[PDB]
Amino acid sequence: MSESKDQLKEKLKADPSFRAELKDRIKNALLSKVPASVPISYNFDSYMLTEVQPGQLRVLEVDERLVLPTNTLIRLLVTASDVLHSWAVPALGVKMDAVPGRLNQVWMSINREGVFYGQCSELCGANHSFMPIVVEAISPRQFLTEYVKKWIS
Amino acid sequence: GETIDKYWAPYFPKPAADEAKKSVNKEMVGFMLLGPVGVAFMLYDFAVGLEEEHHVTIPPYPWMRIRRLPGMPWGQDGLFEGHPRVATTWP
Amino acid sequence: PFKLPLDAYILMLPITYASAAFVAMCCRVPTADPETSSIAYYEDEQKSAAAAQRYDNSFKQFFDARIRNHKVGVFQ
Amino acid sequence: YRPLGDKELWHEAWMYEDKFGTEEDPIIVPSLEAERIIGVTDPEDETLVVWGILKDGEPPRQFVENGEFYVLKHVEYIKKVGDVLEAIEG
Amino acid sequence: ARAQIERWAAEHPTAPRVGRIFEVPLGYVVPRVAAGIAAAGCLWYMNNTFLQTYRPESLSKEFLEEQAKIGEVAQRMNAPPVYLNPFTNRIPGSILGPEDAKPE
Amino acid sequence: HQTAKEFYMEHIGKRHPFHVLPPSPWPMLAGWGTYVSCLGMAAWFHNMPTGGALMAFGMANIAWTAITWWRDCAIEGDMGMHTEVVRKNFISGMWAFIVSEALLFVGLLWACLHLGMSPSVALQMQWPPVGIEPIGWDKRALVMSAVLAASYYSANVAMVAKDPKVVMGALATTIGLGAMFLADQYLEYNETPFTITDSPYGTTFFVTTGFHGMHVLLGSLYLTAALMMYKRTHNAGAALKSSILYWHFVDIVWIAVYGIIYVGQY
Amino acid sequence: DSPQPWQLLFQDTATSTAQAMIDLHHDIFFFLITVVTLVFYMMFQIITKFHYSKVLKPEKLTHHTTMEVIWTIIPTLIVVMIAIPSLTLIYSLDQHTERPGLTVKIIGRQWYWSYEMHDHLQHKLLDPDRLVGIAEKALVK
Amino acid sequence: DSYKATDFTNPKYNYFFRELTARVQGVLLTGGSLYGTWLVVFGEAQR
Amino acid sequence: KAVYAPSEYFKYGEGASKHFGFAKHVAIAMTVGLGLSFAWKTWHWNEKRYIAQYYADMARREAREDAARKSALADKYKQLEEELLS
Amino acid sequence: KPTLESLSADELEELKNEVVSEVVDKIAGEDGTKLADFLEPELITAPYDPRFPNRNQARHCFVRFNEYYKCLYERGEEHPRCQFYQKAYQSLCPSEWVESWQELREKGLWTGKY
Amino acid sequence: MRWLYSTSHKDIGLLYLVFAFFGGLLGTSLSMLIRYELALPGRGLLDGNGQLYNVIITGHGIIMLLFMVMPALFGGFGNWLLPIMIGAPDMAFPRLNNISFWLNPPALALLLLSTLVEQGPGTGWTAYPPLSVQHSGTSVDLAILSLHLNGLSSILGAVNMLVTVAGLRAPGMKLLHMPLFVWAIALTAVLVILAVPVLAAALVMLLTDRNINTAYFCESGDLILYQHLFWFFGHPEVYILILPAFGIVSQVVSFFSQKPVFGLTGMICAMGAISLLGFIVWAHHMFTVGLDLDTVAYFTSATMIIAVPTGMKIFSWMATIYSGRVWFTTPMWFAVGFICLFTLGGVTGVVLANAGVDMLVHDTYYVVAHFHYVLSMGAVFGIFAGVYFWGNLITGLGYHEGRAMVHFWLLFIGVNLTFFPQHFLGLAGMPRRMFDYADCFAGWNAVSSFGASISFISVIVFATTFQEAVRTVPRTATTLEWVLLATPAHHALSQVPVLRTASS
Amino acid sequence: EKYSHEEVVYGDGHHGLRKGYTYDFEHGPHYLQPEKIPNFWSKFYAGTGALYAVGLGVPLFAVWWQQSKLKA
Numbered sequence A: 001m002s003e004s005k006d007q008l009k010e011k012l013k014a015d016p017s018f019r020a021e022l023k024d025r026i027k028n029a030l031l032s033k034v035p036a037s038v039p040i041s042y043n044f045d046s047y048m049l050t051e052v053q054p055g056q057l058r059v060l061e062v063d064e065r066l067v068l069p070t071n072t073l074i075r076l077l078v079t080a081s082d083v084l085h086s087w088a089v090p091a092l093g094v095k096m097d098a099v100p101g102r103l104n105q106v107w108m109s110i111n112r113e114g115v116f117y118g119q120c121s122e123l124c125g126a127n128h129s130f131m132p133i134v135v136e137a138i139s140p141r142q143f144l145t146e147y148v149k150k151w152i153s
Numbered sequence B: 001g002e003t004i005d006k007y008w009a010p011y012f013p014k015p016a017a018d019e020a021k022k023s024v025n026k027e028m029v030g031f032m033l034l035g036p037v038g039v040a041f042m043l044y045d046f047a048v049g050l051e052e053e054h055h056v057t058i059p060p061y062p063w064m065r066i067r068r069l070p071g072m073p074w075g076q077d078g079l080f081e082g083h084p085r086v087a088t089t090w091p
Numbered sequence C: 001p002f003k004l005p006l007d008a009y010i011l012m013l014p015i016t017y018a019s020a021a022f023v024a025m026c027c028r029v030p031t032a033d034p035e036t037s038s039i040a041y042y043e044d045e046q047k048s049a050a051a052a053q054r055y056d057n058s059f060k061q062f063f064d065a066r067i068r069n070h071k072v073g074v075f076q
Numbered sequence D: 001y002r003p004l005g006d007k008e009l010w011h012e013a014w015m016y017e018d019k020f021g022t023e024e025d026p027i028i029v030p031s032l033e034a035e036r037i038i039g040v041t042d043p044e045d046e047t048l049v050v051w052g053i054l055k056d057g058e059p060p061r062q063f064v065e066n067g068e069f070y071v072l073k074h075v076e077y078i079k080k081v082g083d084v085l086e087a088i089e090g
Numbered sequence E: 001a002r003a004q005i006e007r008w009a010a011e012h013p014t015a016p017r018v019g020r021i022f023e024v025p026l027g028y029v030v031p032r033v034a035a036g037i038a039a040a041g042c043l044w045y046m047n048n049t050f051l052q053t054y055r056p057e058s059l060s061k062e063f064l065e066e067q068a069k070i071g072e073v074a075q076r077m078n079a080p081p082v083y084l085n086p087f088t089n090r091i092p093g094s095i096l097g098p099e100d101a102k103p104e
Numbered sequence F: 001h002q003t004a005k006e007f008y009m010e011h012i013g014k015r016h017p018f019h020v021l022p023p024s025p026w027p028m029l030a031g032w033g034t035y036v037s038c039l040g041m042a043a044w045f046h047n048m049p050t051g052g053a054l055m056a057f058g059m060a061n062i063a064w065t066a067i068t069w070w071r072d073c074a075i076e077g078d079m080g081m082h083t084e085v086v087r088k089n090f091i092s093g094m095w096a097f098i099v100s101e102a103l104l105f106v107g108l109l110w111a112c113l114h115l116g117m118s119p120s121v122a123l124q125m126q127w128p129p130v131g132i133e134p135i136g137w138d139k140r141a142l143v144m145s146a147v148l149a150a151s152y153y154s155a156n157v158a159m160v161a162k163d164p165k166v167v168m169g170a171l172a173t174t175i176g177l178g179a180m181f182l183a184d185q186y187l188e189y190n191e192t193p194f195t196i197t198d199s200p201y202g203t204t205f206f207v208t209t210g211f212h213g214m215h216v217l218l219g220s221l222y223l224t225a226a227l228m229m230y231k232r233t234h235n236a237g238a239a240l241k242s243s244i245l246y247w248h249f250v251d252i253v254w255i256a257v258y259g260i261i262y263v264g265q266y
Numbered sequence G: 001d002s003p004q005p006w007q008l009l010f011q012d013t014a015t016s017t018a019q020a021m022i023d024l025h026h027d028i029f030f031f032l033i034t035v036v037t038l039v040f041y042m043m044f045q046i047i048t049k050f051h052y053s054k055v056l057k058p059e060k061l062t063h064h065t066t067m068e069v070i071w072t073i074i075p076t077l078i079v080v081m082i083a084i085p086s087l088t089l090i091y092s093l094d095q096h097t098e099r100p101g102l103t104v105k106i107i108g109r110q111w112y113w114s115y116e117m118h119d120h121l122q123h124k125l126l127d128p129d130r131l132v133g134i135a136e137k138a139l140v141k
Numbered sequence H: 001d002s003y004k005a006t007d008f009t010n011p012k013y014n015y016f017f018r019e020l021t022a023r024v025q026g027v028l029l030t031g032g033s034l035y036g037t038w039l040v041v042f043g044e045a046q047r
Numbered sequence I: 001k002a003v004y005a006p007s008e009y010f011k012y013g014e015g016a017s018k019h020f021g022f023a024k025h026v027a028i029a030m031t032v033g034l035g036l037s038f039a040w041k042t043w044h045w046n047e048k049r050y051i052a053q054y055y056a057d058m059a060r061r062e063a064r065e066d067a068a069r070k071s072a073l074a075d076k077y078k079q080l081e082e083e084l085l086s
Numbered sequence J: 001k002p003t004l005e006s007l008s009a010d011e012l013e014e015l016k017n018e019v020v021s022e023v024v025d026k027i028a029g030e031d032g033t034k035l036a037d038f039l040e041p042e043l044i045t046a047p048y049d050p051r052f053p054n055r056n057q058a059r060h061c062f063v064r065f066n067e068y069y070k071c072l073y074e075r076g077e078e079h080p081r082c083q084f085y086q087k088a089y090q091s092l093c094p095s096e097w098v099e100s101w102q103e104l105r106e107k108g109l110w111t112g113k114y
Numbered sequence K: 001m002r003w004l005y006s007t008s009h010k011d012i013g014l015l016y017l018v019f020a021f022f023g024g025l026l027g028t029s030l031s032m033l034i035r036y037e038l039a040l041p042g043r044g045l046l047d048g049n050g051q052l053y054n055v056i057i058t059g060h061g062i063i064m065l066l067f068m069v070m071p072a073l074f075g076g077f078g079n080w081l082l083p084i085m086i087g088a089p090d091m092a093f094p095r096l097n098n099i100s101f102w103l104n105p106p107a108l109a110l111l112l113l114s115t116l117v118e119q120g121p122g123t124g125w126t127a128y129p130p131l132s133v134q135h136s137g138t139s140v141d142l143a144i145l146s147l148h149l150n151g152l153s154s155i156l157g158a159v160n161m162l163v164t165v166a167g168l169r170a171p172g173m174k175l176l177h178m179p180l181f182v183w184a185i186a187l188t189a190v191l192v193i194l195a196v197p198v199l200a201a202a203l204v205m206l207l208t209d210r211n212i213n214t215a216y217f218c219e220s221g222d223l224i225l226y227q228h229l230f231w232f233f234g235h236p237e238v239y240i241l242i243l244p245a246f247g248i249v250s251q252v253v254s255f256f257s258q259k260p261v262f263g264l265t266g267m268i269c270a271m272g273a274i275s276l277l278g279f280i281v282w283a284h285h286m287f288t289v290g291l292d293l294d295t296v297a298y299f300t301s302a303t304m305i306i307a308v309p310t311g312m313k314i315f316s317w318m319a320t321i322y323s324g325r326v327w328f329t330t331p332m333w334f335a336v337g338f339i340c341l342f343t344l345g346g347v348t349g350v351v352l353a354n355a356g357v358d359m360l361v362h363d364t365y366y367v368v369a370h371f372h373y374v375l376s377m378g379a380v381f382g383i384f385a386g387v388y389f390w391g392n393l394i395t396g397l398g399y400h401e402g403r404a405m406v407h408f409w410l411l412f413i414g415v416n417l418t419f420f421p422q423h424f425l426g427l428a429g430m431p432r433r434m435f436d437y438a439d440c441f442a443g444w445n446a447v448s449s450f451g452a453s454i455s456f457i458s459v460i461v462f463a464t465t466f467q468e469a470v471r472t473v474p475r476t477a478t479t480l481e482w483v484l485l486a487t488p489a490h491h492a493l494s495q496v497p498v499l500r501t502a503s504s
Numbered sequence L: 001e002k003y004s005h006e007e008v009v010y011g012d013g014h015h016g017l018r019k020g021y022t023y024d025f026e027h028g029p030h031y032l033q034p035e036k037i038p039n040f041w042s043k044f045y046a047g048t049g050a051l052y053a054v055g056l057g058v059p060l061f062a063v064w065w066q067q068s069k070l071k072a
């Protein structure tokens, strides 16, 4: 009734095997308090800014950057929809062509935070000069605790 | 009678009658090895031509009947195509 | 025609090396992973993974011990 | 005359003569005109070619150093050696 | 080898043989190449001055002075700002940005 | 004119065995015919009205210019302007043209080998694509291979024969065998259950077999033109030898075409 | 990060791969400087010392087997000395020997880039055995 | 005595093949070239 | 009296290459090229030393925030310890 | 009263569950909104398949997309390996490719068996 | 009638030289619009049109590649100088030589007409799909048909050249006594015959993709296949344009040094090794398209081998000048400049061969600076070296030496100040084929646009160098065109010369 | 005559100055005699100027033509 509860506590005091088993039961019950897995997803476009302000760079500036954590192995799958393009960021040493039908992968590990600028490196038409690339590099804890919460529905 | 060919002919001798017939029969052996049988099967093929039919309609897959530009330079259907297979009104 | 001089055989050693490497690279492509005309090649996961790792490791395994030691430059 | 084996029958020999032209005995070059271009190699180097021009009615002339001497002679026919004189086989 | 040299020197009599490396004197060459360079500079200046249909607002002196106030600093939408190109401008590794420095 | 032959013998013919031509109008006309036919072809691609007629007009002009050029060459052969070394140079030029056509076909079959070996996700990685019923090797294509091998051997007969009747009959047999290779390729092009617009398989099949059929037609016409020069004077010279060389080249090309497309299903 | 005015060499780097590329470039430039210096100095000296005002008549020198073999064999050693680090750099581009932390699907259009992601975020109790022992001593008394 | 009426290389056919064609073709190429240039430069593509 | 070809070349060694000193000039060129190349490589090595010092000082900074993070976590553990013991 | 010397295994198991739950609801919460300081986040992406060693990964995308529907046909709808296949192809395949493949499947233009 | 119906090789070669000069003028005009749009940040004279800028760079690249250097070196100096140099009375096929020339004005006309149709062919000179396929209209078809006609022209010319060298040599003259220009032209013909039909097949596939709705390079095709075929053509193409320059530089340097060429067999073997290696290295243009690392590995290792034969050729030229009696004239300065400045164009090619470094500088101005060193200063200097060398023989006109030196110094200064700053732009990451750039790239762009105007001025000054000639009589030479009168007769070598081997 | 095969083969046996030439290019010592065209240096500079004009003005006309179609 309640002494059997106290007798179970006394058996916790006495038997090390029962103590370890109930410790494992506590561990199993605490894992049932952990929130379940949630999906992080987005789909946004990046356009060049027509008019810049001081502190920004002309031609190279976009409206929506790409946010990537540092010290983390990132898989980048580069592709295209209509013609050929090329994703080039000279700071990161990445330049891979975007081919309609292919899915070219890059493995990349960023050592420091910063802002990295790039442009398209394959002739794609009239506005080949106006498709810039900006990558925003932050710490992994900021990316995992603050940025990904912006994409949770 | 005084052409350039006849003028230079004694300085270009031909490299040396029944040997020609021997060579002709040697090549004619390989000719009749495949000659009459190929012609016979092709004459058989010319009479078994546009008589059989296929009614195997094909669904409009993305790789079938590519129309990046509308139509063809000579019309709607392809050239040499009298019996179009890809299906229209795909149920 | 003429007698090849002593330079041209010192030329012909890396030229023969390059021609042999070109022939080998041409030959080993239809014995690789993505050159399969079926979706049923990948339903056998053991053989597919073994063949693809064999294609990975060849000519790379001669470089792993210097990849691990950052031998990526003439000087250090 | 040099051995006419492996020589084309229309190469007009005098070029295939068995003589070294000296000052007191030059090699007589036949020609259809008053001047003609001929080519002489270096006696010490097969790879080097000197082209010279011989003129009708001139002294013997040497083109390369330590080479043959030459005198041009205007003729109406040049013996097309290979069927002209080895068909004679005199 | 000498006779073709002497023949080419007779068919080209304006080429001098005086015993110097630059056979044509520099008093002839330098003024004319200077005049050609001057004409090229005039064409370049004419292109710069009269052949522009849009001058960017990021090159005006107000933009330039307001940019020189800021320096080589990039903003972030998720973090404090950061100094751009830290190796060539010799920022030490302890300092990441302007605002995170907070000078002593 | 009567001293033109005398001047030629005095200055060119008696001095070297090579052939020096008088001035000719056909290269310029052939070049501007190519200009007109290229304009017509570009207009016919995009369905511009009276564009196909312009392309046909330019092609007809190129054909007429080439026919008159070749008639002039045949006339120059019949008047004994070509020595033996000139005919050897003719065969050398035919060998160079054969090498160029060979690399054209190498580039064409490179596409078949590339596209057939590794199908893409756009095809749902299946070669040949679903719906496409490929043409088999155990049928009319084997009859074509037999007929073209017989044409190879019959053209080989006329190269070595010395009886003129044997040469004429062998050439006529080779030409008639070549015409049966094309009249049956037309039946393949009519019975085939796919189009040049249906998948890269249909694309590569039709383009490569069409280029081969065009070369077969050119070789058959060249063998026909070499026979009529022999039907007149019982001598053809370089016209017989070069046409036989071109025909053997076409035969060798069919081996690669059959063994890559029909057997390898590429 | 971003380019600068009057810049000569590469930009600054944020990965070890790009710094390896730049170091390989500077290692190649080490050999190129010596090659260009030797060519330019020897050309200048040959030009000045063999002008016709210095030379009465030239010398016959068509071949020299030793020097031909020397300038054939020295650049081949330079080629193979360059090639092995470049081959090592090419093969080190795949770095899948870790756990990947992120997928980014970059799509190139006319005329804007498009960025995608679809991952899953899950949480894990940081060092639970200390909390397990805390619960153990909370339940034992 | 070595040419017939059927012969393609008959010298009685030399004027028609080598002189009349060199002017008829020479003006037809011009009249086709100008029309083709106008058709390409000032034409509207329907495909 | 015939037309003689003139002496057109010296033999290699007794003309105007006896005073050239080919090996000396090659040694001078290689010395100058190696000196310039070693100056360039010294500059590159100095830059790499600066990059290594930068990343070392960055790691020295980065160790400090995460020590004070786990110290704060241990302080929260010491609070929750007496939360279940009071 | 049933003591520990007289209780069975199932009643003892229920008592263990009650003893654990009544205190861990105080520690972590009934839902778990108190562990946020002791929780470590981690992002899950599709793993490296050794079957696909090249840089072009469109075949990896296509194979995972087909394996999901094979898992759905064979091992029910909610088997964990089926969600492994789903979260592996969603981590790799661009969404335009995916929606094209479902509209092909809806049209009847899919060459797969299942 | 003389210049429309010609069968002589000397007239057809001169027609090639004039047509190449016209193509150089057109390309120089198209190159000033590029450097005048690129002088300042923002929008220049093109009014912010990017399609027009793409059309301009496409037309400029195609014209300067195919219609300037190729007809000048291969069709120009080759047709004029080959039968004289070997002793042939004519070409082997004299009417084929005329249709070789007469297919070039229709090709240039179609290329210039493509600019005025629709919005033009803005694709680049490589014409990569699906950008070439997406273009509505007719202009891209005209540009590709221009490419077909030019390719057929080059194939027919190579056929004539190869039958001429093989079968019409002078008696007694083997393939050992030909000068190095003949060897260069013969190896160039071999490369043309082997490489151009691959381009013809690739462009036929492009036409069928554009117009016939086929599936060569499309959704269901393979877009890397076009780059494979195109660069398998295109890398032998750049050695086609550079081997006659090697031959010309050998002839010029040998002449004015009073010495034969050092290491003749080594020179021929180096040219042959360059010719053979040019067919197996082609995917060094495709490092960033997503090829497997073994392919990249091989093409990196194989591309660096081409440095050794070129280094032997350069050191052999320097040994040819060594221990001579050298007289520095205007063609001599165009060959010393070739040797000193082609080295700067090849050392950056070594850097571009290494694929790790090429990940940073692909499609930047480092590439542009490299290939304007090897073309504007290797091939153009070779063209201009032979104009001041053989010009009085070919045209009959002399030249003023002072104005030619003025022209040389202007060109030399204007090209070392146009493309030397383009190295620093490419190392800092400025992309190719762009007209609006970032604000920090302004200084080197201004310097490069300053150099282009000096180049244009040197183009203008070249027209003023011609003058009347003085004609003399020849006795002896080392090559067969320097015993002829200037100009030679319509049938030069009235008697076929023979080479007599002495008793030795 | 005038259409014989000998006319096709050996050409037409013309001797001397062709129509408006001042020198025999076919059978004289030089195939190009530039000091014998009357007013040679005037026509030479006229042709050079026309060549420079066309080769430097065709691209500008193409720029003007495309930009005049957008400005409509």
Ligand code: HEA
Residues within 6 Å of the ligand: K017, K020, K021, K024, K025, K027, K028, K031, K034, K035, K057, K058, K060, K061, K062, K064, K065, K068, K069, K072, K123, K124, K125, K126, K368, K372, K375, K376, K380, K383, K387, K411, K415, K418, K432, K433, K434, K448, K452, K455, K456, K459
């Ligand atoms: C033959 C090769 C060649 C030559 C000589 C040149 C010459 C010049 N080029 Fe370039 N260029 C290319 C080949 C060449 N180019 C190619 C292939 C492209 C790429 C196109 C594409 O991307 O699709 C390009 C593109 C290109 C760019 C890159 C633009 C971009 O990325 O968008 C630039 C930028 O500065 C440039 C400028 C110049 C300048 C200022 C010259 C100056 O040298 C000006 C020329 C001056 C000369 C003196 C040369 C003319 C020669 C003669 C007139 C001699 C003729 C004489 C006789 C026949 C007797 N051109």
Ligand code: HEA
Residues within 6 Å of the ligand: G035, G039, G075, G078, G079, K238, K239, K241, K242, K284, K285, K303, K304, K306, K307, K308, K310, K311, K312, K314, K342, K343, K345, K346, K347, K348, K349, K350, K352, K353, K354, K358, K361, K362, K363, K367, K370, K371, K374, K375, K378, K379
């Ligand atoms: C004249 C034509 C010409 C010539 C001769 C060359 C010669 C070379 N080229 Fe280039 N190239 C082009 C024309 C040419 N190229 C063009 C037009 C492009 C751009 C195409 C486009 O996209 O539009 C291009 C681009 C190009 C690329 C592709 C880069 C890219 O587009 O991303 C590469 C990569 O390997 C390359 C390398 C080389 C090499 C190694 C040589 C070698 O042959 C050079 C060899 C010479 C030397 C190396 C110097 C001499 C050697 C010595 C003095 C000995 C010392 C040397 C050592 C010790 C190593 N060049």
Ligand SMILES: [Cu+2]
Residues within 6 Å of the ligand: K234, K235, K238, K284, K285
């Ligand atoms: Cu290349």
Ligand SMILES: [Mg+2]
Residues within 6 Å of the ligand: A121, A122, K362, K363
């Ligand atoms: Mg590229």
